[PDB]
Amino acid sequence: KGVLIAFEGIDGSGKSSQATLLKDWIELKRDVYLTEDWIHDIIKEAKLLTPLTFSLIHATDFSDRYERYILPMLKSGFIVISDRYIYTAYARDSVRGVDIDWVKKLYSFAIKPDITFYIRVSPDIALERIKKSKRKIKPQEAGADIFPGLSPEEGFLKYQGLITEVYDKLVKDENFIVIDGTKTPKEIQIQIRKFVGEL
Amino acid sequence: KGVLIAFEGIDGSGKSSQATLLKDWIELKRDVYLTEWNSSDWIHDIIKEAKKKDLLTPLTFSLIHATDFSDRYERYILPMLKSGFIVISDRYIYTAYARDSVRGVDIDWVKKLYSFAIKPDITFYIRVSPDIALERIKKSRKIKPQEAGADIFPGLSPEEGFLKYQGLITEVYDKLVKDENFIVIDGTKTPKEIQIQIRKFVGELID
Ligand code: NI
């Protein structure tokens, strides 16, 4: 009865918007919940911390939300949508040198999603879209902790390029439902609503 | 070369005394750094205070401590070992193994969780029954809620919780002996005799 739906994609993929668009629409049919913080003070108090410790910090926060929101609502048959799930950690942590199989074991208390949508779009195209909207490129998005002194536009191409690599390597094993993010937001959402329409 | 010596044991087992006494001896011949597992640092404190309102699950409790330990390890413990120090740990990862697993977190997952830390060259388990440790505790001092497993057994007298809670910790340590190669020291012996035995095992190694 409980169903877990996850979205993954690089920054700029529109995956958060797709996740919220799907919530609003599923709410018409049945019980759904969207994953919605001290991490603030920790990062702010650093100033370094190793990537290992960073991986633990994010896993601690993930465990908290998982056992206090995600898992209980699944037990009450909510659909739960999460627009980042453990695969985001797999990528975030392993591009910074942490043994991905170690990260997988770390997160092995979490269940596999019934569906995972990989909204796949290249970094080139993600950037030109961020630029057409005139938004500012967050340092986290540029991977500036790994590439200081690249511009923000080129960090984004490099870091999100490394992140894409990891997502592509997980596609087979993790049964990602690969979606073409070059399509428009409407075309993407309608295809997502159609896929979810099935299970 | 750097060497890592861990002390394990239940509350009231004397292990901290034994750690400190070892430190005072070894610091006469060479460089030595004593750290205590229970002395959590900045990251732990920020998380616990920030979540003071919420009830944390055991898994989360366990990650908070591993996270904080990962920082202390890369910042203090590994550099002291690389710099040639002898490192003495009064409580080490095995304490988390026991703590987190009597609260329901799967011990095999905790082992994986801490897989990043190196095994001690020597681990001393100063074995003392919970009754005997209770008796020393009385004959001195009140028992802290954490020593009594207060969260797990809020319906018990401090004394009785210490016996049930420390009993469980003892089971976990006993089941690690073989795998973790603990050197099991009979903690009913006098403190002077315990230290003499520890000093001889350490002597054998580092000489
Ligand atoms: Ni603590």
Swiss-Prot record, chain B:
<keyword id="KW-0547">Nucleotide-binding</keyword>
<feature type="binding site">
    <location>
        <begin position="9"/>
        <end position="16"/>
    </location>
    <ligand>
        <name>ATP</name>
    </ligand>
</feature>
<keyword id="KW-0808">Transferase</keyword>
<protein>
    <recommendedName>
        <fullName>Probable thymidylate kinase</fullName>
        <ecNumber>2.7.4.9</ecNumber>
    </recommendedName>
</protein>
<dbReference type="InterPro" id="IPR018094">
    <property type="entry name" value="Thymidylate_kinase"/>
</dbReference>
<dbReference type="InterPro" id="IPR039430">
    <property type="entry name" value="Thymidylate_kin-like_dom"/>
</dbReference>
<dbReference type="InterPro" id="IPR027417">
    <property type="entry name" value="P-loop_NTPase"/>
</dbReference>
<dbReference type="GO" id="GO:0005524">
    <property type="term" value="F:ATP binding"/>
</dbReference>
<dbReference type="GO" id="GO:0006227">
    <property type="term" value="P:dUDP biosynthetic process"/>
</dbReference>
<dbReference type="GO" id="GO:0005737">
    <property type="term" value="C:cytoplasm"/>
</dbReference>
<keyword id="KW-0545">Nucleotide biosynthesis</keyword>
<dbReference type="GO" id="GO:0006235">
    <property type="term" value="P:dTTP biosynthetic process"/>
</dbReference>
<dbReference type="GO" id="GO:0006233">
    <property type="term" value="P:dTDP biosynthetic process"/>
</dbReference>
<dbReference type="GO" id="GO:0004798">
    <property type="term" value="F:dTMP kinase activity"/>
</dbReference>
<dbReference type="Pfam" id="PF02223">
    <property type="entry name" value="Thymidylate_kin"/>
</dbReference>
<keyword id="KW-0067">ATP-binding</keyword>
<keyword id="KW-0418">Kinase</keyword>
<comment type="similarity">
    <text>Belongs to the thymidylate kinase family.</text>
</comment>
